[PDB]
Design a protein around this nucleic acid. Structure first.
Lengths: 86, 97, 101, 86
DNA sequence: ATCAATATCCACCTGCAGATTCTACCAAAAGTGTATTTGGAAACTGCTCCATCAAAAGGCATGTTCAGCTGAACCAGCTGAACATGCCTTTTGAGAGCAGTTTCCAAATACACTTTTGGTAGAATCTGCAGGTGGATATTGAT
DNA sequence: ATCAATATCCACCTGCAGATTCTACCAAAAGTGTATTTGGAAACTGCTCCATCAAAAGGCATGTTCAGCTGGTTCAGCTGAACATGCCTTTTGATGGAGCAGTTTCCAAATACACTTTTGGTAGAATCTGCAGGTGGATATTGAT
């Protein structure tokens, strides 16, 4: 697990367990993002073509980028499409 | 270096096999099978002999009770041959101490 | 030959019979059987682990029991002048053996 | 996706395996209905055996089921087994 | 029946994954001696068992008779085996839990003596039930 | 539908073999106290269980083709349940008297138990070869024709 440098967030990778008492009926492998000083979750990142398990997850010191290291893979999750110029 | 000691009947079976068919070996798994087989037969006979003792208010289990148990469990000629071997064996034991 | 070679019905089964009766290797694949064992054990007690040899032993016992059952089944079938086994044969066999269901 | 391999359960014990077992039993021609019933039967057998094994397991305060427990459980049901210890 | 296809049987070769064999030891077998049991010779009794009789009675042997059953022929159809295939599920290889020992002890439990003591053998009464007695139904089959 | 024939359930009801009550004992249950034996809570060691991800080998979900099995129908025998009849093997019910079930005496034959002294059965480290696997080719087997 890891902090986010400029907020009170937490970022973690998931690894389902059939024996864990799940509150949710849907248990998929994904990146979870919790709040530090409350207890509960606030966001979940998921993308097919990456259905492996995210071992490592690290944000930037800047706050605008994320990297993930899965087995035999390195993934970059940065923000998407914008509009265009002439 | 805690070093265990698990007992078995393997070596005796191997001896008998080399006596009866000298040019032949036997794998470990089959020997394990024969070991379990011997254990099973021993348990059956001992249990039967025990019940025979209890029904007749006898506190000693003797060769006679073993003989009776064998006559019960086993069929026919197999019983007769086993009994003959046992009688020969006990007769040899009783004399040549 | 213009025609692909084709055996008449009731020969490849026989070939299978002789092949599988000459050999002793287990017919069922390990993994789904393993998953089945774990799934069933979960409903009685939680967080159990299984040694491999225990699963192999169970597999052997199951195959021997079913093999014997199919033998008895085929006899029950043959009594009715059929060659194809059906469920009522199985139900009869289990009724005669003295088991529950 | 709903793959759940054929049920994520017993239905992975496919038809041709049952066919092979029936071939060992001398069987030549099999109806389509056999399969389901067979599975049910198998399940029942396994249940009883495992229960006894687990009961032995519970007596010794272990969480790993051993071969010996299974052998004894098979012995009490009149299905003695040789070749896995005792 | 003849010939093509094609799996199965069977000769010949190599190496390595399991079989077999050497070696230093410790749990186990065995010989003394004693004590401590225990089951067979001897002697008897008394309940229960083995060979006979006699007066019925209820069941077996044998002999008619016919309603209803067990194969044998045949066949519409269904349904489950044989193959192309592609495609997708199953095999293989790159640290911490827990089974298996070990200390050793607070707790559990056999065992010698007495003291009760409820359980059992056996005499002395109860009464529900095996029979009977008779009447009213309920199946069954003929018609 | 209906109505005669046989078999079955149900109210009254009585004397007794089996059920229950009641004495009087003494062979089992507890108490007290003691001597002896244990299962289970702390340390420690070495197998081997949890069950991901690439790369690859080989098994199955699907669809396709058709022969040979199921299971329905029709029917010629046939054979076995019902039954009457006689009579004759068994049922009750006694009586005898021989001898085995079972008991008691007691001590000669067989064994635990406790000690000491061999010893061979079992891990672990060095050697072997039968068989897995491969390679290849003659004959047996199905089946079209």
């Amino acid at each position: 697990a890891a902090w986010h440098p400029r907020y009170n967030l937490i970022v973690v990778g998931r690894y389902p367990d059939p024996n864990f008492k799940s509150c949710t009926p849907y248990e998929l492998r994904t990146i979870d993002v919790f709040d530090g000083n409350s207890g509960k979750m606030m966001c979940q990142l998921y993308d097919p073509e990456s259905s492996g398990i995210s071992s490592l997850n690290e944000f930037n010191p800047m706050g605008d980028t994320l990297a993930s290291a899965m087995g035999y893979h390195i993934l970059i999750w940065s923000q998407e499409e914008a509009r265009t110029r002439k | 270096r805690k070093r265990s000691r698990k007992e078995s009947y393997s070596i005796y079976v191997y001896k008998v096999l080399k006596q009866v068919h000298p040019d032949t070996g036997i794998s470990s798994k089959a020997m394990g099978i024969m070991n379990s087989f011997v254990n099973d037969i021993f348990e059956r006979i001992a249990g039967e002999a025990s019940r025979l003792a209890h029904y007749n208010k006898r506190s000693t289990i003797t060769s006679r009770e073993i003989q009776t148990a064998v006559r019960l469990l086993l069929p026919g000629e197999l019983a007769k041959h086993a009994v003959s071997e046992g009688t020969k064996a006990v007769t040899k034991y009783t004399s040549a101490k | 030959v213009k025609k692909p070679h084709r055996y008449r019905p009731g020969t490849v089964a026989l070939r299978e019979i002789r092949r599988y009766q000459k050999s002793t290797e287990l017919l069922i694949r390990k993994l789904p059987f393993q998953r089945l064992v774990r799934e069933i054990a979960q409903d009685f007690k939680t967080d159990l682990r299984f040694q491999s040899s225990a699963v192999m032993a169970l597999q052997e016992a199951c195959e021997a029991y079913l093999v014997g059952l199919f033998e008895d089944t085929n006899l029950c079938a043959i009594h009715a002048k059929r060659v194809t086994i059906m469920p009522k044969d199985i139900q009869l066999a289990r009724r005669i053996r003295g088991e529950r269901a | 996706r709903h793959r759940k391999v054929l049920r994520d359960n017993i239905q992975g014990i496919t038809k041709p395996a049952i066919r092979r077992l029936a071939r060992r039993g001398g069987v030549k021609r099999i109806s389509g209905l056999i399969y389901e019933e067979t599975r049910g039967v198998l399940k029942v057998f396994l249940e009883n055996v495992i229960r006894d094994a687990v009961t032995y397991t519970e007596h010794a305060k272990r969480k790993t089921v051993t071969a010996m427990d299974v052998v004894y459980a098979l012995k009490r049901q009149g299905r003695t087994l040789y070749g896995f210890g005792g």
